[PDB]
Structure formats: C-alpha cells, structure tokens
Amino acid sequence: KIRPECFELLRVLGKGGYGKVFQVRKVTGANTGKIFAMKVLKKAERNILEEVKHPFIVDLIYAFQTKLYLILEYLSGGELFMQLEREGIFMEDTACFYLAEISMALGHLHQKGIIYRDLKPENIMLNHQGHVKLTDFGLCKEGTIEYMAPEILMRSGHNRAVDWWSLGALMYDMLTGAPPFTGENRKKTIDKILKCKLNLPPYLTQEARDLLKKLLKRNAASRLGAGPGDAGEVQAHPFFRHINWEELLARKVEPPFKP
Ligand SMILES: [Cl-]
Ligand SMILES: [Cl-]
Ligand SMILES: [Cl-]
C-alpha cells in the first residue's frame, strides 16, 4: 500500500553511519504535499521507534522494505549545537532548558529499556518550534561474587548510567564551548576520558558545577542518574530548580532560541 515511489526525493539531509536520510515530499495519499524525512538502509531502529512516543523524540510515520525505508517527521529546527557554534557558549538558563528536555527523553527511553550509548551534539535536533528531538539509532542497546569486579556486577558500559555521563559531557560543552576531555589525537583523547581529571571553569554557579561533577563521575555506580530513580535523580538537582516539568513536557515553556 506504500512504496518508494510514494515519495519524492528533495535532498539529502545527511549520510549517517549506515544509510542516507533524504528530505522527501509525499506525492500520493491524503498527506500529499507533506514533507518528511526518509532513512534508507541496505536492537533495531524500527522496533525502538515503533515503540517510543515522546514529545522529545522523533516520531515514526511509516516503515516498509524493498532495502528498508523509514518515514520520520521532518525536523526543521536543525542541529542544536550549530546554535552553540554561533553563541560560542550558552548560559546556564539556556543550557538548563535543553538539558531538561533531553533528560525527559532519556528517562522515557530508559523506562522503555533502551540506552543511547553514544549521545552526542549531532543527535540533538530541534523541531520547528525549537524543542529538543532525539534522533539516530543503530548504536543503541537493550555463584559467589565477593571476588568479582564491580564493573561486572553492574553491567558497566551497559546500563543507564552511560547516558548520564553523556548528558554531562554535553552540559560541559554547552557551558564552556568544548567537551571535557579532548586531545591532539583520538588516542590521547580516549585516554583523557579514561584517566584524566575534570577541570571546571571557575565561572560556573555552584549548582552547575556540582551537577557536572556528579554526572561526570567515573564510578558509574555513584553517577547521578545511575540509581533506580534514573532521570528523577537528575531532574531533582538544584540546577533544575526553576523547571516546571509539566509545562516543559507540554512544550509550553518557551525555548530560548526560535529557529
Ligand atoms: Cl541499569
Ligand atoms: Cl564553580
Ligand atoms: Cl534561586
């Protein structure tokens, strides 16, 4: 009832790992004239996206094969950090808004049993009105013990905590203009991530600095958000004290930038 020829290619939005994503116009049906995105590929993205339904996650509309086509809503707001590029750095209020929306989306995903694992600033799209939209999938997952390493007993690298670190790295980038650990090189970079000490600029509020320290904690078990409260642990932090979560979820909070 639906096929590749039901859509008109308008342009490539990008070529992410795996397949391409085109802007398309739907040429038949009742939604004729309507603009979507269409991802093309030669736990899986379709399943996850079928499942999840959040104000702050890109919606799925159609899916079908040849090889695989996913029709998603088209996001006009573009990349969030292209906004950071221009501002150089966000202020705590502005950063707070986006981090909060992103926190709700992660929290939802986590409840749905899914972790991002590789949430980066490219993944943060904005919709026509400037609200967050979480977007790419594919790199995403899900006797005695007295002598067993902690990382095993908690499924390190494989639990919700990995995403709260990322939210942390991303807060850091928003507030300072750069990620927390970076080197001249890829190796020198991962090595700073693994072992290096966090350096916070002195001009951060105490609330922001405290949150950053709790999110960017190497001990995954003690990291804010790692507990069963998940996003709740994070949203309760004083940094987010001026957030009305019901209004935020209603997208009735005004985004600080309107594309
Ligand atoms: Cl977990
Ligand atoms: Cl500080
Ligand atoms: Cl206050």
Curated annotation (Swiss-Prot):
The active site is at D118 (proton acceptor). The phosphorylation at this site is maintained by an agonist-dependent autophosphorylation mechanism. Residues 7-240 form the Protein kinase domain. ATP binds at L13, G14, K15, G16, G17, Y18, G19, K20, V21, K39. Widely expressed. It is found in: Synapse, Synaptosome; Mitochondrion outer membrane; Mitochondrion. Belongs to the protein kinase superfamily. AGC Ser/Thr protein kinase family. S6 kinase subfamily. Serine/threonine-protein kinase that acts downstream of mTOR signaling in response to growth factors and nutrients to promote cell proliferation, cell growth and cell cycle progression. Regulates protein synthesis through phosphorylation of EIF4B, RPS6 and EEF2K, and contributes to cell survival by repressing the pro-apoptotic function of BAD. Under conditions of nutrient depletion, the inactive form associates with the EIF3 translation initiation complex. Interacts with PPP1R9A/neurabin-1. Interacts with RPTOR. Interacts with IRS1. Interacts with EIF3B and EIF3C. Interacts with TRAF4. Interacts with POLDIP3. Interacts (via N-terminus) with IER5. The autoinhibitory domain is believed to block phosphorylation within the AGC-kinase C-terminal domain and the activation loop. The TOS (TOR signaling) motif is essential for activation by mTORC1. This is Ribosomal protein S6 kinase beta-1. The chain holds residues 85 to 371 of 525 of the full protein.
